[PDB]
Enzyme design. Structure first.
Site, PDB file in Angstrom:
ATOM      1  N   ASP A 114      -5.748   4.869  -4.437  1.00  0.00           N
ATOM      2  CA  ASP A 114      -6.976   4.156  -4.726  1.00  0.00           C
ATOM      3  C   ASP A 114      -7.243   4.080  -6.220  1.00  0.00           C
ATOM      4  OD1 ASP A 114      -7.504   3.935  -1.926  1.00  0.00           O
ATOM      5  OD2 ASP A 114      -8.345   5.970  -1.993  1.00  0.00           O
ATOM      6  N   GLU A 142      -4.044   0.015  -4.386  1.00  0.00           N
ATOM      7  CA  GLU A 142      -5.304  -0.705  -4.366  1.00  0.00           C
ATOM      8  C   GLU A 142      -5.568  -1.177  -5.775  1.00  0.00           C
ATOM      9  OE1 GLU A 142      -9.712   0.475  -2.806  1.00  0.00           O
ATOM     10  OE2 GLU A 142      -9.124   1.262  -4.784  1.00  0.00           O
TER      11      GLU A 142
END
Ligand SMILES: C[C@H]1O[C@H](O[C@H]2[C@H](O)[C@@H](O)[C@@H](O[C@H]3[C@H](O)[C@@H](O)[C@@H](O)O[C@@H]3CO)O[C@@H]2CO)[C@H](O)[C@@H](O)[C@@H]1N[C@H]1C=C(CO)[C@@H](O)[C@H](O)[C@H]1O
EC number: 2.4.1.18
Length: 646
Positions: free
Chosen positions: A314, A359
């Site tokens: 992330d 991401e």
């Protein structure tokens, strides 16, 4: 420049080889750092704390005597301690009891810290802080199942364990294992993206505010119970990815990684550069050798100890651009990118079938290309333009004004060598201040007319129909993988929200009303049935692993999109009212075509207008740049998949 990045990676990796004996050895820090009962009954301990004046171990086991067990200062800011075994052969630090590292500062301050390497942390009752629980259970969990065969194509169920029940409480690992996995399997998903597992003290952070990086979050149960979850998912043929949050850390110092040795550096950068103003978080000093040992060891940890099949990293954009596709030309933080390269290298050298996902919203090229080419080494990026296009259309455009060309362009505009994961809506769109697709489509009628006992109104008709179609266009055209967030597969009503100040610690929206799909008197079953059939169909035909679709028609007048992928014929009628009776559609090969999927089917909440036994023949008749054509009948707001059976 990519030649430079790879020269830089190679140099750092070479050093890891000459100084740490290779990235395998390097990434096994968790074997000595931390606290460890030894086979001889004594306790060995080790920390990195370069700004500490002194380092000490204390806790229940020694009556919270702060200084009776001081570590020895070693070279390179490290500290180690060995407590001798007790004469009476009993355990030094009992399982379940509390510990704390004590740091004495240059200022003469006395700091209490949780080990950066802690296995397990628990918050007790109404307490402000987490306690560090020594974890030395009598029976460790023995894994009984092997990794699933690497999947041809990824069909990912984005999951959060705490909210995975209908109850307004933090649901458990055990609950998930028994009650949710079977559902995920039944839907045709072959992969689980497991959110919010890394320990985070603030539940409403949706798992993004990490406090203990090596701790399987205690909310849901014990470390053993996570292993069983992962082990059990494997027994079902499902692979499990972890959300790795290595982009920032919580500012907590009492029970977080901030200010560990009394400094603002250590694991992070000193100064304003080492703080993320908008997230109010610390930022790692990726150039720092011990921070590389920590983070890489964290990756190894999640792989070896919990048997995860891969990771989604992330906040990659922040790692690359925190200093600052209007991203071209910006200076990338090569320290961060080198860490990510090392991470990917480690993951794939340990097992080539492991999967990593980035991401990244910047769409930086080469994030998903080989390390030897100067790339990040990710297998996949999330296709984040897609959820935006559906939101734009639904918010800003009457259905008669949707542009098929824009839709086809957004879904297919990809870099040829980059696999990416397509999804129709994110977990962020499921949250309180936002709108889900189902809600965009159905607004208030979602609470009045989702019962089969009410009228199938034109609003609910349109909603049910577009929900299926948006998902299918995304699924067939959008990428090389599909993702779906928990609940959106059956059009889950309301929104998701966690306990916090803003709602007086309400768990009322912190759940999943999974029972809605098991209720025959409700209409969710329709959306759910379509999802299941959509995935079983891809499992049979494999369009996600196929080359990019050949789009034969993106007709703005009729609102028809037609294309081929993996040999199948996909036909969408997005027109809000017109239906088409002898509509000619191009095909690659001639022969007999049959409906293998039809969104108008009754089990999908359709209108059941098509006879699936009707044979569709494409003869030699050129159309839209195709050598052959068939004629189809396709209603307003229906999607069809036809197969050639010759
Ligand atoms: C290459 C070397 O880098 C790392 O060591 C650094 C520490 O991490 C830093 O915090 C900093 O701390 C100490 C000062 O260097 C020292 O002068 C003293 O004042 O204490 C400071 C803190 O109190 O500086 C260190 C050097 O930059 C890393 O931790 C360390 O493991 C690395 N060492 C490798 C290299 C060799 C020889 O090639 C081997 O001897 C080691 O086993 C390797 O680990």
């Amino acid at each position: 420049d990519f030649q430079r990045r790879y020269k830089q990676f190679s140099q750092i990796l070479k050093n890891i080889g000459e100084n740490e004996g290779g990235i395998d050895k390097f990434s096994r820090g968790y074997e000595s750092f931390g606290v460890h009962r030894c086979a001889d009954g004594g306790l060995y301990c080790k920390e990195w704390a370069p700004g500490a004046e002194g380092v000490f171990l204390t806790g229940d086991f020694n009556g919270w005597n702060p200084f009776s067990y001081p570590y020895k200062k070693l070279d390179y800011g490290k500290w180690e301690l060995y407590i001798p075994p007790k004469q009476n052969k009993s355990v030094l630090v009992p399982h379940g009891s509390k510990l704390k590292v004590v740091i004495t500062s240059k200022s003469g301050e006395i700091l209490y810290r949780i080990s950066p390497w802690a296995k397990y942390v628990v918050r007790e009752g109404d307490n402000v802080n987490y306690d560090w629980i020594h974890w030395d259970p009598e029976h460790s969990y023995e894994f009984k199942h092997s990794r699933p065969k690497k999947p041809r194509s990824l069909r990912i169920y984005e999951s959060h364990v705490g909210i995975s029940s209908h109850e307004g409480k933090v649901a458990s690992y055990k609950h998930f294992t028994c009650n949710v996995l079977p559902r995920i399997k039944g839907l045709g998903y072959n992969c689980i993206q497991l959110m919010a597992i890394m320990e985070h003290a603030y539940y409403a952070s949706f798992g993004y505010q990490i406090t203990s990086f090596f701790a399987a979050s205690s909310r849901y149960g014990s470390p053993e119970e996570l292993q069983e979850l992962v082990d059990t998912a494997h027994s079902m043929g499902i692979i499990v990815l972890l959300d790795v949050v290595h982009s920032h850390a919580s500012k907590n110092s009492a029970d977080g990684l901030n200010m560990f040795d009394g400094t603002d550096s250590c694991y992070f950068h000193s100064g304003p550069r080492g703080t993320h103003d908008l997230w109010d978080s610390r930022l790692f000093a990726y150039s720092s050798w011990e921070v590389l040992r920590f983070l890489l060891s964290n990756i190894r940890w999640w792989l070896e100890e919990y048997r995860f099949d891969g990771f989604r990293f992330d906040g990659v954009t922040s790692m690359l651009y925190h200093h600052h596709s209007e991203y071209f030309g910006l200076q990338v933080d090569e320290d961060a990118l080198t860490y990510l390269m090392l991470a990917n290298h480690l993951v794939h050298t340990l097992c080539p079938d492991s999967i990593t996902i980035a991401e990244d919203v910047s769409g930086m090229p080469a994030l998903c290309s080989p390390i030897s080419q100067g790339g990040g080494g990710f297998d996949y990026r999330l296709a984040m333009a897609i959820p935006d296009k559906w939101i734009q259309l639904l918010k800003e455009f009457k259905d008669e004004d949707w542009n098929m060309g824009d839709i086809v362009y957004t879904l297919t505009n990809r870099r040829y060598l980059e696999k990416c994961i397509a999804y129709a809506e994110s977990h962020d769109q499921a949250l309180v201040g936002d709108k889900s697709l189902a809600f965009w489509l159905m607004d208030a009628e979602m609470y009045t007319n989702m019962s089969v006992l009410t009228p199938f109104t034109p609003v609910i008709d349109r909603g049910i129909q577009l929900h299926k179609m948006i998902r299918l266009i995304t699924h067939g055209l959008g990428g090389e993988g599909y993702l779906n967030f928990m609940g959106n597969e059956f059009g889950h009503p309301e929104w998701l929200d966690f306990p916090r100040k803003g709602n007086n610690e309400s768990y009322h929206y912190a759940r999943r009303q999974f029972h809605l799909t098991d209720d025959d008197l409700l209409r969710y079953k329709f959306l759910n049935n379509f999802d299941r059939d959509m995935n079983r169909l891809e499992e049979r035909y494999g369009w996600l692993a196929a080359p990019q679709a050949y789009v034969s028609e993106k007709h703005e007048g009729n609102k028809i999109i037609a294309f081929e992928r993996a040999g199948l014929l996909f036909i969408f009628n997005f027109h809000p009212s017109k239906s088409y009776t002898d509509y000619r559609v191009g095909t690659a090969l001639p022969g007999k075509f049959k409906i293998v999927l039809d969104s108008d089917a009754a089990e999908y909440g359709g209108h059941q207008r098509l006879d699936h036994s009707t044979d569709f023949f494409s003869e030699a008749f050129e159309h839209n740049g195709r050598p052959y054509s068939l004629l189809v009948y396709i209603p307003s707001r229906v999607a069809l998949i036809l197969q050639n059976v010759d």
